[PDB]
Symmetry: C2
Subunit: 291 residues, 2 copies
């Protein structure tokens, strides 16, 4: 935050925009943050690189620990070298937790082999984690475990780069977001905004144009949710599309993804900026809290 | 930055993307000093727009505001300036991490006719030894290219006024970190900044251009100096306020380009450039003003 003379007009002006300002008449402790990533995605290293790229964009030091949900056999070397089990970290507190997506869009919760382990991490997070960010399927899991919302599935997979808008001009998690912006989705989970409004107390910060919640969070910042995959690389949707075409599914192209909707053309990461802002804002205002 | 075990694949992978990674070798974060030489005619609006952006960082940024003009040059006191601003002699023996020189209403004035040209030269010479990273905005770009590279002033045949399309040149650069491949930013200038001018008469790296061929962002490889030719700090309504004053003052002018919805000045304009203004100023603080 800036530190300026108490009566500079910027002080009252920026405070009215929900911006914290320091004044020369008053005065912080800025220590390394501890962030845990529960990696449920099957391509473990690709997912590590995607999230760690975006967790790199703060001047704050982010000490990262990687959490595995069970010990099912990614190289076994990789997990044994770099990941911890829940019993290894259960006595620790963290500033942040990310629960990634998982390929569980079409699996009932009672058929998810590690469902008990997921309930145990989410219950523990309430007292042990300052802010937990749930991504994609983890949003569906958390809506079920924290609010008793039953699984809801779309008619077809939402796959593409979609238009969104922010709802709160002065919010922290969307600080610097354009009024409308692009972010990618790849999900069977259905997240209509009305479901979040009618069955939770969460504040909705951004929606898709079609009426889905994209970003929402608790007022105390303990829990935050993102229903897209802003961490995806340019090619990530294309890899899923080509694997489904090879299997004989012969699906549509992802929306607004390939140039001219022709999969011979190279897709670009048209969603980069607001993925960077999102993770930078989550570290700077949710994981780190000046107050 | 993240701190992970040295052998994690992310380490070599993000280093190949020009991203600094700490590895689990030894884990004290200091306040930054930034000076703003405010040359804009709306001093308080300008302070609010740049301070909004410098506020979006966990780093503590101690701000001092610098005036170019003496207290006695004015027919009446400038209350605001007297209360909040220092003069050069007050800060000449201090060191700063950052300096911003704003734009100035001097696009049609020859440097030798600019009344405070000596004072501007004195600040720029001082900044070489006293400021880790200087950001020049709009006219200050022309001033700096003159003093540092001997480039004469160039003026466009027609004023640029609107929100224009841009692209980045360096996928892994620090100052454009997180920028989309193409993005919007406002311009409002007669100053002419063809990219060929920067390539052919300086050693500066060009990081982004307008679609019509102007340099928008460029910097030195040592990060001592950085240049922006547009106004991503502008509020939604800044171009609108100027447009309505021009209309009221009797000028026959088009709306600013790509600014009002449907090009209709009854429509509320949106700050369509907000995101890349935030990335720019956040990246400037984090990688240029703060280094280690």
């Amino acid at each position: 935050p800036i530190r300026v003379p108490d009566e500079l007009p910027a002080v009252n002006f920026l405070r009215e925009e929900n911006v914290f300002v320091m004044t020369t008449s008053r005065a912080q402790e800025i220590r390394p943050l501890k962030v845990l990533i529960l990696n449920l995605m099957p391509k473990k290293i690709e997912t590590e690189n995607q999230f760690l790229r975006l967790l790199s964009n703060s001047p704050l030091q982010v000490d990262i620990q990687l959490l595995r949900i069970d010990s099912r056999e990614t190289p076994a070397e990789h997990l044994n070298n770099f990941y911890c089990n829940f019993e290894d970290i259960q006595d620790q507190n963290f500033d942040g937790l990310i629960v990634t997506g998982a390929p569980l869009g079409l699996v009932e919760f009672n058929d998810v082999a590690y469902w008990p382990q997921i309930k145990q991490v989410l219950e523990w997070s309430k007292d042990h984690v300052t802010s937990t960010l749930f991504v994609c399927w983890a949003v569906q899991a958390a809506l079920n475990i924290l609010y008793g919302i039953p699984k809801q599935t779309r008619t077809e997979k939402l796959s593409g780069v979609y238009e969104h808008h922010i709802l709160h001009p002065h919010a922290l998690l969307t600080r610097g977001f354009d009024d409308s912006f692009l972010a990618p989705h790849s999900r069977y989970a259905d997240f209509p905004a009305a479901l979040i409004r009618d069955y939770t107390d969460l504040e909705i910060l951004a929606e898709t144009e079609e009426g889905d919640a994209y970003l929402f969070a608790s007022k105390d910042k303990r829990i935050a949710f993102v229903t897209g995959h802003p961490e995806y690389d340019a090619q990530t949707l294309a890899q899923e599309f080509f694997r489904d075409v090879e299997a004989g599914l012969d699906i549509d192209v992802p929306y607004n993804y390939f140039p001219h909707n022709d999969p011979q053309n190279t897709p670009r990461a048209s969603w980069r900026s607001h993925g960077n802002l999102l993770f930078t804002n989550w570290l700077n205002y949710y994981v780190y809290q000046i107050h």
